[PDB]
């Protein structure tokens, strides 16, 4: 439930400590945790909102010039002087102009020309700093079992750096503990929150401090004092005797195309919600019980309400209806071939499925992990057991290949933290994580200023180079290539 | 540009493709993609369904080019002569015909 | 401005062509509208600035 049709869900089957399992939660997908004697729990990261951000360095992307004025002096006089030069609201430019004997000033040198124009902004795109505080993640939990196809079965957990660990109380199943690392989630304190006009982005610090436009730091109020005062004003020169001042228009689509690779975000009220990120929680499943065990089996007839649908990952979802009234009772369900000898084949990724209500007709939804062959879903005890025919396509080799592909993509997206997905914890895992940290730091220092054009080019170049360099560096260049080009074709 | 009333149309994994009636209108921008669907969402099957979104397009600012043939170009040549003119009549443009 | 041909034809912006009669008809239209696909579930449309 909440994970079935997600198409980017991952199974964290396994718990070698009888306890906590590490799990990295992402905005895209969700995680189903299935332990030995514990109910399957579906966990998903839903929203991360940022609130009361401080304001830093608003930029001006649409300027406007108010009133121009100018001054000239004949060729051997001081310099052109405008009283508006000492005013810090005016852009002033000084140049040389042809003068003499026609302009009423008798000498034929070059004269000085000063033009000043008042500067007035508009729009003022603003960036804001995201501190580790004032940041909050929301995690939704659901529990497999008695739930109908459509609460005590679902929970919501708020995690902020002020309260990194929490417990979700699932009535009857106990409570699931989450000990989480909010501060090291997406490496904020390098990211600013940028708004232009009712559109908001997550943007890098360096990109925001390297953008050429009039700017002023701090919160705005009244008429600000704009800095640089150019890159929006152009002093063009006429036929060697005039100066004209123009402004460049609105600079907004230029910024929109400059912001390629920055994350969108949507703000409601003061709080702005991001739609992409990641977090890392450790799941203490030592107070998780099974609500169902110690229930007698149901002895009645079941019906198939809709069908046994197939999810994208191969698991079957079955929705059953119960006709008897035995109260809370176990659902006898299995995956079998050879109806003569009902030998359980496959795995049931559901609880010791139970019907909760005690009425005439109740409903149930359970999901199963069938074997790759043809099989039958067998529900019921004897002489009333409904069965459904079900066929699964893949093979174990294809499944292992797809698992390696998913792991590779997770690594490309999540750097070293990728090693914390099934992080139950040994010495091979920690060694792999350490050497991955080292190689990732080196790779981010050397490469990592490139964006799928630069990377594809330099990858093909290192490919050829390592192919023909004829030394022991062949392997080095081929591995650097493979890293780069896989990082690319992951997409 | 300026955008306007968006709309969308979605279909179950095993159906055709989504179609809005506003795709037969040359004033709307429409995009078709694949969306996770199934059972919970309300359609019973679990593949990728098809989603179409359309939005009305309007232009609030425009920009125009114009062709220049090498005829109907007029040049204005100004001519002056030395001799009797005094310094004042260097940058004076007046009834030069007289 | 005075502009060269082949700079005014290789421009990626929605273009009418010549005769403006009534409700204009912009030929391109995919150079100013961005369809961002949210997370699995939806689609959103924005315009560039």
């Amino acid at each position, epitope marked *: 439930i909440r994970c079935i049709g997600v198409s980017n869900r991952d199974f964290v089957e396994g718990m070698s400590g009888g306890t906590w399992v590490d799990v990295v939660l992402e905005h895209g997908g969700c995680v189903t945790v299935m332990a030995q004697d514990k109910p399957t729990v579906d966990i998903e990261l839903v929203t991360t909102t940022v609130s009361n951000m401080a304001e830093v360095r608003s930029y001006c992307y649409e300027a406007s010039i108010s009133d121009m004025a100018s001054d000239s002096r004949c060729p051997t006089q001081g310099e052109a002087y405008l009283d508006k030069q000492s005013d810090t609201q005016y852009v002033c430019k000084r140049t040389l102009v042809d003068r003499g004997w026609g302009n009423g000033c008798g000498l034929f040198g070059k004269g000085s020309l000063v033009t000043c124009a008042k500067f007035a902004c508009s729009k003022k795109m603003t960036g804001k700093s995201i501190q580790p505080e004032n940041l909050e993640y929301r995690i939704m939990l659901s529990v497999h079992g008695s739930q109908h196809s459509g609460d005590e079965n679902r929970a919501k957990v708020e995690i902020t750096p002020n309260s990194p660990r929490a417990e979700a109380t699932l009535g009857g199943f106990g409570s699931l503990g989450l000990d989480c690392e909010p501060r090291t989630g997406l490496d904020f304190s390098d990211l600013y929150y940028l708004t232009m006009n009712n559109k908001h982005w997550l943007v890098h610090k360096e990109w925001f401090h390297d953008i050429p436009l009039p700017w002023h730091a701090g919160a705005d109020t009244g008429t600000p004092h704009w800095n640089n005062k150019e890159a929006l004003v152009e002093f063009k020169d006429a036929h060697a005797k005039r100066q004209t001042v123009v402004v460049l228009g609105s600079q907004e689509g230029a910024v929109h195309t400059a912001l390629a690779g920055a994350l969108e975000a949507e703000m409601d009220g003061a709080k702005g919600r991001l739609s992409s990120g990641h977090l890392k929680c450790r799941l203490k499943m030592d107070k998780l019980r099974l609500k169902g065990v110690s229930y007698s089996l149901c002895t009645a007839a079941f019906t198939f309400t809709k069908i046994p649908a197939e999810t994208l990952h191969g698991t079957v979802t079955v929705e059953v209806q119960y006709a008897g009234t035995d109260g809370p009772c176990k659902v006898p369900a299995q995956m079998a071939v050879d109806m003569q000898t009902l030998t359980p084949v496959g795995r049931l990724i559901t609880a010791n499925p139970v019907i909760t209500e005690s009425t005439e007709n109740s409903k149930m939804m359970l999901e199963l992990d069938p074997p790759f062959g043809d099989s039958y879903i067998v529900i019921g005890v004897g002489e009333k057991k409904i069965t459904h025919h079900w066929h699964r396509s893949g093979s174990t080799i294809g499944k292992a290949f797809e698992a390696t592909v998913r792991g590779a993509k997770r690594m490309a997206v999540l750097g070293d933290t990728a090693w914390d997905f099934g992080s139950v914890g040994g010495a091979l895992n920690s060694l792999g994580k350490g050497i991955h940290q080292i190689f990732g730091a080196a790779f981010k220092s050397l490469f990592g200023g490139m964006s799928w054009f630069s990377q594809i080019l330099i990858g093909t170049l290192l490919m050829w180079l390592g192919l023909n360099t004829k030394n022991g560096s062949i392997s080095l260049m081929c591995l650097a290539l493979g890293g780069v080009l896989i990082f690319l074709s992951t997409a | 540009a300026s955008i306007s009333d968006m*709309a969308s*149309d979605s279909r179950c994994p095993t159906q055709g493709e989504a179609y809005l009636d506003k795709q037969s209108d040359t004033q709307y921008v429409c995009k078709r993609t694949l969306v996770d669907r199934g059972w919970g969402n309300g359609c019973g099957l679990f593949g990728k369904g098809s989603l179409v979104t359309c939005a009305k397009f309007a232009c609030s600012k425009k920009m125009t080019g114009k062709s220049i043939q090498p005829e109907n170009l007029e040049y204005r040549i100004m001519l002056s002569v030395h001799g009797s003119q005094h310094s004042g009549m260097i940058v004076n443009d007046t009834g030069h015909e007289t | 401005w005075l502009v060269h041909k082949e700079w005014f034809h290789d421009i990626p912006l929605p273009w009418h062509a010549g005769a403006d009669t009534g409700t204009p008809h912009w030929n391109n239209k995919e150079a100013l509208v961005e369809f961002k696909d949210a997370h699995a579930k939806r689609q959103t449309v924005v315009v560039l600035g």
Partner: antibody
Amino acid sequence: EVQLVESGAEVKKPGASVKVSCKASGYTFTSYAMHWVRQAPGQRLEWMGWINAGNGNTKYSQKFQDRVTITRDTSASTAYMELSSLRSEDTAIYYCARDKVDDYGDYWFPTLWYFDYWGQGTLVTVS
Amino acid sequence: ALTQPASVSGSPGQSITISCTGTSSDVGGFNYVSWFQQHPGKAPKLMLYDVTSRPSGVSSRFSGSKSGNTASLTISGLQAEDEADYYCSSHTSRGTWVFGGGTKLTVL
């Protein structure tokens, strides 16, 4: 428990505009979307539109696209529907119904049980 | 928008069926089919959602079925307190709601 209560009945001459509220109680108002359904006397029900009380997005039917405006007041837990340019056909009963909004805060897909709770109704008489 | 029979009558103690025919965009493609019961004076009450599924405090006599473009509500064991208006509703593919014409059930 869940209780949606609308304003009392109202009589308006044609050409005027009606504004009917729907106060919600017994649940978190910010996490639900309110639909407005009109029922003519002894006729079918007519869906007019909905408003997501969380962020404020709205969607109206094609039949009322340019005649109805739905707004909300979270602090007061109210949803208002205003219909302008009344006609004799608009003499009908107006109901408000809740529907759960997705956990991401968006209302793209409705939940299977859309109109689990309704309002008692409000008769608008166009004379 | 949804084709529903004008009226349906049945003697107390027998089953009866009310059909609801739609198109391939509202009832044909989606399990978004709901049945509402409305006694005169009161507001409609959700009797069935998700086609077959029904809420908690609803008698198990009401059943739902769907074939192609036609949904169907079945009332087995017609009781006294069943004379009301029954409306089928569906969430279309374009994101709008459509209701049925209406059926007045008479228990006689």
